[PDB]
Structure 1
Amino acid sequence: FGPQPISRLEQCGINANDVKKLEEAGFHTVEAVAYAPKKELINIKGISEAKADKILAEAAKLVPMGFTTATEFHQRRSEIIQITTGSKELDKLLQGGIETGSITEMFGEFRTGKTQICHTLAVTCQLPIDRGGGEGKAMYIDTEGTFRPERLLAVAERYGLSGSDVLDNVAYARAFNTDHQTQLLYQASAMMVESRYALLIVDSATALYRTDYSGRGELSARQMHLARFLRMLLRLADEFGVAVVITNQVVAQVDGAAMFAADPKKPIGGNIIAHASTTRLYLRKGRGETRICKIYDSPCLPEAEAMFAINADGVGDAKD
């Protein structure tokens, strides 16, 4: 069960031309138009103030957005699914795994294993819910050109799942530039409503912005575009109940006039949207053959560290 398709609004007395204009705009379900303010609906053409007000009021009638007791919210948060990361120690660290309905930014230095974690999450997302999975196909928006299905086949063989259907479930695309990356979100929102999607990996979020928006005086436009991208990701996560995972690259100190996100502090959203990343995981190589994952910031989980390893079957517990 998920959102309510926009066709329900047709049952409420709205002519189909406005519905199709909203569909072209990008709002595919009643949730996406209910959550939108009057300004966004007014900005698109062919709609007047009265029509926008009536559709907004009807949508608010359809989906409840009023107050509720905290016990109801505790019950609701006790039913969301957490996706196992493939490692028992990291699963213990995350108190269940990667939660669905938020943003889990995992960042670290170069050659640490973020892509391996993304691969393992994408394959384990198809597991039955009783084994820690999410019972849903997993998308993969890839900007680094670093998607090799051989790892997915290896992990699917390890877990015993049929490789054919595991491959047939995971979708794929590539982002050659920032605008194509953004339009991929429109396509994903269009194509999500037709099936059950429980994961969406963007590896990595900031890779294209370090190069395309290269310039001392281009910082402002880059920041606004990144904020828009992150807002779209947040809306997608809230609307469809998916588990968005992204990736960032970091390095000691900084370079340039505070241009990149190469800092443990100063999250990806920066000064515009600081609350974008609900969960942040620092991935560190450590000393010797070690791998460490530390919860840098979480609203509920406390700071801690953990040990894990990467073998030919994916990410697993550190074998001694």
Structure 2
Amino acid sequence: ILSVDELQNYGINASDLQKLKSGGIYTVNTVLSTTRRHLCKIKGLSEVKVEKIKEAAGKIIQVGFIPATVQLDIRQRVYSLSTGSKQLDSILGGGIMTMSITEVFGEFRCGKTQMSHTLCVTTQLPREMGGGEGKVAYIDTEGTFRPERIKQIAEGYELDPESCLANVSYARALNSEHQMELVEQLGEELSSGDYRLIVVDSIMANFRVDYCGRGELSERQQKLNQHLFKLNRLAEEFNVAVFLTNQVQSDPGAGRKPIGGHVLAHASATRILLRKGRGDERVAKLQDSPDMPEKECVYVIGEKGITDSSD
């Protein structure tokens, strides 16, 4: 993590830097990621300044073709966050993977929110125990965040519940526009490097309501795509994992069919389908993954959150 202040010594005045920090650009990588057309929109920034900044940023970090062997070593930094269920972790290859977007969808009571709360605790577990040992950023759109539940789970893992709660940042996304604003501003908070997980529950809850009908569909997906693109951009640059929960819908024309359309399906690197099972058992199926094959596992929602049926 290199702060935009690093640009200052290369020859950029501090006055511009605040404009960059004003526009939500607190890291050098975010400078390279942002397009020149977008930087120009930043207030107090001219095309001459934008070009100057971009040239300076390249002087610090070089981006270009590199041998896949080198990209393998960089890939070593990725964390695998335990979901609390060893069977579910096995199919996922270790759990939720950082630097990528993971999505879970299914009917109600299927454990989507419960899994999010479990990740809030396990994420704080030290590496080699399924966790990344870092803070968690929680974005609530359903309104079901329960701090007591995290404390109860933390006790199951034998962690100080007060300490675990402190390492979780909670934001309530009142509407889609607010939800997008929260994500765009995560750059400053994440720049510290403490965070490891970003949870959006649920991704499409607000978008479903704000944009209604055929006419709004085109604008809805375009806004959602930019929202997803930013989330994916955040995950890669800060090495944090993005966990998204999604609803489902019934298809009268024709597992359950998720919502969000193709824009969400393409953006999500990993998608898991959660179904109700006999009694309290749940069935998780890995619909889409970049590195793991399709499989199913059985998990149970218990005191410790998501855990193995026997566990």
Query: Which TM-score band (shorter chain)?
Result: over 0.9
Structure 1, unmatched stretches of 5+, are 256-261
Match 1:292 to one of 283, 286, 299: 283
Corresponding residue number in structure 2 for 1:268 = 260
Matches within 5 A, 1:1-320: 3-253=1-251, 263-264=257-258, 268=260, 270-271=262-263, 275-319=266-310
The structural deviation recorded for 1:149 is 1.6
Q: Which amino acid aligns with 2:107?
A: E
Q: TM-score scaled to structure 2, two decimals?
A: 0.93
Do 1:141 and 1:203's aligned partners in 2 also have CA atoms closer than 8 Å?
Answer: yes
1:80-116 per-residue CA deviation (whole Å, 9 max, x = no partner) reads 1111111111111111111111100111122211000
Percent sequence identity is 49
What is the DSSP-based 3-state SS (H/G/I as helix, E as strand, rest coil) of the residue aligned with 1:101?
coil
Q: Deviations over 1:203-236 (max 9, x none)?
A: 0010112222223321122112111211221121
The structure in which a higher percent of residues are strand is 2
In the alignment of these two chains, the number of paired residues is: 309
Aligned AA (1:306): C
Does structure 1 retain, via aligned residues, the 8 Å contact 2:281–2:301?
A: no
* Deviation >4 Å, runs of 4+: none
- Tell me: CA distance 1:254–1:4, structure 2 relative to 1, closer, same or farther (3 Å): farther
Aligned residue identity for 1:12? Y
Report the Cα distance in structure 2 between the residues aligned to 1:251 and 1:206, rounded to whole angstroms.
Answer: 12
In 2, the alpha carbon distance for the partners of 1:195 and 1:70 equals 26
The alpha-carbon distance between structure 1 residues 33 and 310, as it changes in their structure 2 partners (threshold 3 A), is: same
Structure 1 range deviating more: 167-176 or 284-293:
284-293
C-alpha RMSD over aligned residues: 1.9
How far the C-alpha of 1:164 sits from its partner, in A, is 1.1
The one-letter code matched in structure 1 to 2:307 is G
TM normalised by structure 1 equals 0.91
